[PDB]
Design a protein around this ligand. Structure first.
Ligand code: NA
Ligand code: NA
Length: 151
DNA sequence: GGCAGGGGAAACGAAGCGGG
């Protein structure tokens, strides 16, 4: 195993998670309100108006915000239990990597109450909710990846 | 630590690397 710089470790970590999510989406899509984080020009991650210092802040912020929804995913893939867990843990690893390359920590209790609301919804909305966490996490990560390759 | 960091990767958005 050749040694990887920080940036290289980060690039591989995101490709790892993107792979895991893809595996969950197949288990979702074939078996077929929210304010999920999203990239916007203000964040300065796109080519138009790129700023590294604030982009990295948005990525870490967005990922910390994504954690409640990854926790929600754990009890929606009973057989793919291992795969949801891997996505949840790898993302926590990713945050830890990004925090050394670098703000708004989500409030635990606000998260915990949102979680039990999502968990109480009826099956149909729950299946809708799963699909869009996956889709939106994907897009935040693809965009995070595209960014970080510049930094 | 160590054997090494922090239990375990090219076609037009399929193919296929390690216990306490
Ligand atoms: Na080890
Ligand atoms: Na160890």
């Amino acid at each position: 195993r050749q040694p990887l710089t920080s940036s290289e470790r980060i690039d591989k970590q995101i490709r790892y998670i993107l792979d895991g999510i893809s595996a969950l989406r197949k288990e979702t899509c074939n078996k077929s309100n929210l304010n999920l984080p999203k990239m916007a020009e203000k964040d300065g991650c796109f080519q138009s108006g790129f700023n590294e210092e604030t982009c990295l802040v948005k990525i870490i912020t967005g990922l910390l915000e994504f954690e409640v929804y990854l926790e929600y995913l754990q009890n929606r893939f009973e057989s793919s239990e291992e795969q949801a867990r891997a996505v949840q843990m790898s993302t926590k690893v990713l945050i830890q990597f990004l925090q050394k390359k670098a703000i708004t920590t989500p409030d635990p209790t606000t998260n915990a109450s949102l979680l039990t609301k999502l968990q109480a919804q009826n099956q149909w909305l729950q299946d809708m909710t799963t699909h869009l966490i996956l889709r939106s996490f994907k897009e935040f990560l693809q965009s995070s990846l595209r960014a970080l390759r510049q930094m």
